[PDB]
Design an enzyme around this catalytic site. Structure first.
Site, mmCIF file in Angstrom:
data_model
loop_
_atom_site.group_PDB
_atom_site.id
_atom_site.type_symbol
_atom_site.label_atom_id
_atom_site.label_comp_id
_atom_site.label_asym_id
_atom_site.label_seq_id
_atom_site.Cartn_x
_atom_site.Cartn_y
_atom_site.Cartn_z
ATOM 1 N N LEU A 1 -2.910 -11.183 -2.735
ATOM 2 C CA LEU A 1 -2.689 -10.006 -3.564
ATOM 3 C C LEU A 1 -1.359 -9.306 -3.323
ATOM 4 C CD1 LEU A 1 -6.251 -8.383 -3.622
ATOM 5 C CD2 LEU A 1 -5.146 -9.833 -5.330
ATOM 6 N N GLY A 2 -0.687 -9.561 -2.213
ATOM 7 C CA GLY A 2 0.628 -8.985 -2.015
ATOM 8 C C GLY A 2 0.999 -8.917 -0.555
ATOM 9 N N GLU A 3 2.279 -8.627 -0.330
ATOM 10 C CA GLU A 3 2.842 -8.460 0.999
ATOM 11 C C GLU A 3 3.574 -7.130 1.072
ATOM 12 O OE1 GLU A 3 5.283 -11.861 1.884
ATOM 13 O OE2 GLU A 3 3.501 -13.120 2.163
ATOM 14 N N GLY A 4 3.600 -6.554 2.273
ATOM 15 C CA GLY A 4 4.317 -5.322 2.520
ATOM 16 C C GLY A 4 4.951 -5.344 3.896
ATOM 17 N N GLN A 5 5.665 -4.263 4.209
ATOM 18 C CA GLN A 5 6.272 -4.143 5.527
ATOM 19 C C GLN A 5 5.239 -3.942 6.627
ATOM 20 O OE1 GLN A 5 9.910 -2.091 5.958
ATOM 21 N NE2 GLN A 5 10.309 -1.851 3.761
ATOM 22 N N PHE A 6 3.992 -3.638 6.271
ATOM 23 C CA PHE A 6 2.928 -3.388 7.235
ATOM 24 C C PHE A 6 1.879 -4.487 7.285
ATOM 25 C CE2 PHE A 6 4.314 1.055 6.443
ATOM 26 C CZ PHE A 6 4.639 1.374 7.743
ATOM 27 N N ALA A 7 1.502 -5.058 6.145
ATOM 28 C CA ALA A 7 0.342 -5.935 6.105
ATOM 29 C C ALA A 7 0.408 -6.805 4.861
ATOM 30 C CB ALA A 7 -0.954 -5.122 6.132
ATOM 31 N N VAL B 1 -2.251 -8.411 1.780
ATOM 32 C CA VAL B 1 -3.537 -8.138 1.149
ATOM 33 C C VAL B 1 -4.022 -9.396 0.447
ATOM 34 C CG1 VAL B 1 -4.811 -6.655 -0.432
ATOM 35 C CG2 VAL B 1 -2.893 -5.737 0.869
ATOM 36 N N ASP C 1 1.856 10.217 0.055
ATOM 37 C CA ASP C 1 2.432 9.007 -0.513
ATOM 38 C C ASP C 1 1.976 8.816 -1.949
ATOM 39 O OD1 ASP C 1 4.181 6.922 -0.412
ATOM 40 O OD2 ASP C 1 3.058 5.717 1.041
HETATM 41 C C1 X50 Z 1 -6.978 -0.492 -0.789
HETATM 42 C C2 X50 Z 1 -5.910 -1.634 -0.888
HETATM 43 C C3 X50 Z 1 -5.840 -2.484 0.381
HETATM 44 C C4 X50 Z 1 -6.116 -2.502 -2.135
HETATM 45 C C5 X50 Z 1 -7.292 -2.724 -2.849
HETATM 46 N N1 X50 Z 1 -7.002 -3.545 -3.866
HETATM 47 N N2 X50 Z 1 -5.616 -3.859 -3.822
HETATM 48 C C6 X50 Z 1 -4.843 -4.673 -4.657
HETATM 49 N N3 X50 Z 1 -5.490 -5.344 -5.811
HETATM 50 C C7 X50 Z 1 -4.729 -5.982 -6.949
HETATM 51 C C8 X50 Z 1 -3.705 -5.058 -7.596
HETATM 52 C C9 X50 Z 1 -3.808 -3.694 -7.501
HETATM 53 C C10 X50 Z 1 -2.828 -2.858 -8.115
HETATM 54 C C11 X50 Z 1 -1.797 -3.413 -8.804
HETATM 55 C C12 X50 Z 1 -1.699 -4.754 -8.904
HETATM 56 C C13 X50 Z 1 -2.687 -5.598 -8.280
HETATM 57 C C14 X50 Z 1 -3.460 -4.816 -4.378
HETATM 58 C C15 X50 Z 1 -2.926 -4.123 -3.251
HETATM 59 N N4 X50 Z 1 -1.482 -4.205 -2.872
HETATM 60 C C16 X50 Z 1 -1.053 -3.568 -1.581
HETATM 61 C C17 X50 Z 1 -0.555 -2.104 -1.769
HETATM 62 O O1 X50 Z 1 0.308 -1.775 -0.678
HETATM 63 C C18 X50 Z 1 -1.694 -1.159 -1.748
HETATM 64 C C19 X50 Z 1 -1.398 0.133 -2.522
HETATM 65 N N5 X50 Z 1 0.086 0.431 -2.550
HETATM 66 C C20 X50 Z 1 0.856 -0.621 -3.247
HETATM 67 C C21 X50 Z 1 0.242 -2.017 -3.059
HETATM 68 O O2 X50 Z 1 1.264 -2.963 -3.033
HETATM 69 N N6 X50 Z 1 -3.729 -3.367 -2.495
HETATM 70 C C22 X50 Z 1 -5.083 -3.251 -2.802
#
Ligand code: X50
Lengths: 275, 65, 286
Positions: free
Chosen positions: C9-15, C17, C113
């Site tokens: 689902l994605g990558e970040g500077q912390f973790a 998903v 944030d």
């Molecule tokens: C609660 C968190 C761990 C969570 C739950 N679902 N989910 C998804 N689902 C799919 C999706 C969602 C939104 C837009 C596109 C695809 C992606 C994602 N991306 C990591 C983030 O850091 C988290 C939020 N800030 C920016 C993000 O990049 N986090 C999460």
């Protein structure tokens, strides 16, 4: 907020008997594990309790001499972590020295108290190699401590309820001319309450109010109007009984004695040396 | 299918906490540290600290396990 | 553990998903402070418009947070040119955001944030505040904060002037910015630096006075700017109704104390006026 917190829901218990049950279960499960992994080397639950009291005192000493100055909230969080950990864990499995250090280490992070690992472990009266080994052990036990707390890291302490009660008294209870003179002794009583199991049995507001009331009674001041009028009768009875039971828990507290503690420390070092 | 504001119903198991705006006129703010001009500029007032202190002093005072 | 990784689902500077079983797993200092912050905060909070921490687990200094799986976020909705944001849709997004924020503020926690991609939408149209990695408790004088929090395009002017101590306004302003982005379909104030962000704020809303902001001069990074009159609100948002304009003006008040709280915003006529917020099952999907 405490009223919907994890501390209230999962880590406030009905009686001293329930705490004794959990600790005895811990001692027996370690015994069963060791026997299945293979004697007078085992520690009894009361011996475990004596060791846990001694090491909570050690944790308090460490948190006291800590630099940068440890906030009181961090110290309370760490001590509560230690109590909760040894509710369901034997000191014969995880050594309380390392567990108490890990409690302080985790509490600093949770409270948002900013310290790095080198500056955290530089507070120990040891050798730099000993400090490195201690840091390695703390890092190894951090996740274990978090798991044993069931990921409930926020700890509600009695200090902010104490301050709120001081404000409320200063505002709405003119009979008490200066509530601030109650703080010192009440603070002392707070510390004594923290030595017992009260933090696992009563709310922080109850603990803070009990300390304030005990200070008032020690001062010769009657503050029953504060409960009856300012706090606005069954509920008053339950509150009074909670306060008296807390004062009795303080009265019945037995601090660890040097000789028994030394004997139990030898026993625990043998437990951790074997296997 | 309209909307209507519902106040947040959370049991606190303790004495009623005075509302924030009332604190100053009820005498509470005479017993907390005044917010400095920089804090007030940033949006921090002594009412916040006093309200938090009272809410914590009253939270779960009547509750039992 | 009990979860097998389905998708990335994605990558970040912390973790990083992943989507697993549906849930989302976010995988010498020790355990990461951002993960501990999310754990410690989300365990004490339970609200429909706040992301739920279902579980946590890990090995060594690694840890895996488990959350409900979130279908999309507001940023994807805003940038989707096939999607039309009717006033009802905007009202519903604003309502869910403000109800979650009201709950959060009552428990003395600032998000710090807030931004469209941190407002996640599930398959039922329920908006949840997510990414609590910078969230912090507020209301305690003995704790100081950093002003670098909140990303620049949604950063409140008090933060941009170096406010260490602040309150709910830092969230509310971001909410205002988000509302503006919902209306214009473009970032309201896309500054390139702190100076550019402040310049855009003052050129759009006016250089604030010693009256609108009584103690602005006390902020440690305060800079005297050019007296921009500020584009009138009805000119920035040509299609905003009067109630919507009052809500926007309250969210964009330069005085952080005077800026409307989540509770006060929820009490405004905009949310009670016709048309009502659209039900979550009817909210648009990208
Ligand atoms: C609660 C968190 C761990 C969570 C739950 N679902 N989910 C998804 N689902 C799919 C999706 C969602 C939104 C837009 C596109 C695809 C992606 C994602 N991306 C990591 C983030 O850091 C988290 C939020 N800030 C920016 C993000 O990049 N986090 C999460």
């Amino acid at each position: 907020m405490y009223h919907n917190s994890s501390q209230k829901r999962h880590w406030t218990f009905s009686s001293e008997e329930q705490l004794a049950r959990l600790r005895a279960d811990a001692n027996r499960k370690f015994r069963c594990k060791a026997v299945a992994n293979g004697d007078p080397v085992f520690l009894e639950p009361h011996e475990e309790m004596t060791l846990c009291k001694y090491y909570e005192k050690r944790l308090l000493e460490f948190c006291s001499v800590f630099k940068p100055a440890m906030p009181r909230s961090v110290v309370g969080t760490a001590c509560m972590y230690f109590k909760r950990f040894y509710l369901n864990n034997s000191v014969m499995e995880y050594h309380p020295r390392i567990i108490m250090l890990t409690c302080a280490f985790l509490a600093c992070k949770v409270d948002e108290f900013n310290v790095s690992s080198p500056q955290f472990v530089g507070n120990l009266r040891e050798s730099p190699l000993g400090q490195e080994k201690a840091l390695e052990q703390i890092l190894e036990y951090e996740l274990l401590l978090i798991q044993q707390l069931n990921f409930h890291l926020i700890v509600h302490n009695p200090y902010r309820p104490f301050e709120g009660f001081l404000i409320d008294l200063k505002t709405r209870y003119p009979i008490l001319e200066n509530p601030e003179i109650l703080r010192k002794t009440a603070d002392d009583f707070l510390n004594r309450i923290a030595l017992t199991d009260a933090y696992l049995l009563y709310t922080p507001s109850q603990i803070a109010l009990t300390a304030i009331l005990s200070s008032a009674s020690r001062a010769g001041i009657t503050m029953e109007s504060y409960l009856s009028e300012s706090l606005m009768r069954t509920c008053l009875s339950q509150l009074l009984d909670i306060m008296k039971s807390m004062r009795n828990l303080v009265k019945k507290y037995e601090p660890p004695r040097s000789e028994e503690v030394a004997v139990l420390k030898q026993k625990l070092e043998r437990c951790h040396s074997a296997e | 299918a309209l909307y209507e504001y519902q106040p947040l119903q959370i049991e606190t198991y303790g004495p009623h906490v005075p509302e924030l705006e009332m604190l100053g006129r009820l005498g509470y703010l005479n017993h907390v540290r005044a917010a400095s001009p920089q804090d007030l500029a940033g949006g921090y007032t002594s009412s916040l600290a006093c309200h938090r202190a009272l809410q914590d002093a009253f939270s779960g005072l009547f509750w039992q396990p | 553990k009990r979860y097998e990784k389905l998708d990335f689902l994605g990558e970040g500077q912390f973790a990083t998903v992943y989507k697993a079983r549906i849930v989302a797993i976010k995988k010498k200092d020790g355990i990461n402070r951002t993960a501990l912050r999310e754990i410690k905060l989300l365990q004490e909070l339970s609200h429909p418009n706040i992301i739920g921490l279902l579980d946590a687990f890990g090995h060594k200094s690694n840890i895996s947070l488990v959350f409900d799986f979130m279908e999309t976020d507001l940023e994807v909705i805003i940038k989707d040119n096939s999607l039309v944001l009717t006033p009802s849709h905007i009202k519903a997004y604003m309502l869910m955001t403000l109800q979650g924020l009201e709950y959060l503020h009552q428990h003395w926690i600032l998000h710090r944030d807030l931004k469209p991609n941190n407002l996640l939408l599930d398959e039922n149209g329920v908006l949840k505040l997510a990414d609590f990695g910078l969230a912090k408790s507020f209301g305690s004088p003995n704790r100081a904060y950093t002003h670098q929090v909140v990303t620049r395009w949604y950063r409140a002017p008090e933060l941009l002037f170096g406010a260490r101590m602040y309150g709910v306004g830092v969230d509310m302003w971001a909410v205002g910015c988000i509302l503006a982005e919902l209306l214009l379909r473009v970032p309201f104030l896309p500054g390139d630096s702190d100076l550019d962000q402040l310049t855009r704020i003052f050129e759009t809303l006016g250089t604030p006075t010693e009256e609108q902001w009584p103690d602005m001069c006390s902020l440690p990074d305060y800079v005297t700017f050019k007296s921009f009159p500020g584009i009138p609100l009805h000119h920035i948002f040509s299609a905003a109704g009067d109630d919507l304009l009052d809500l926007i003006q309250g969210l964009f008040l330069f005085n952080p104390c005077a800026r409307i709280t989540a509770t006060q915003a929820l009490k405004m006529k905009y949310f009670s006026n016709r048309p009502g917020p659209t039900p979550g099952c009817q909210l648009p999907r990208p």
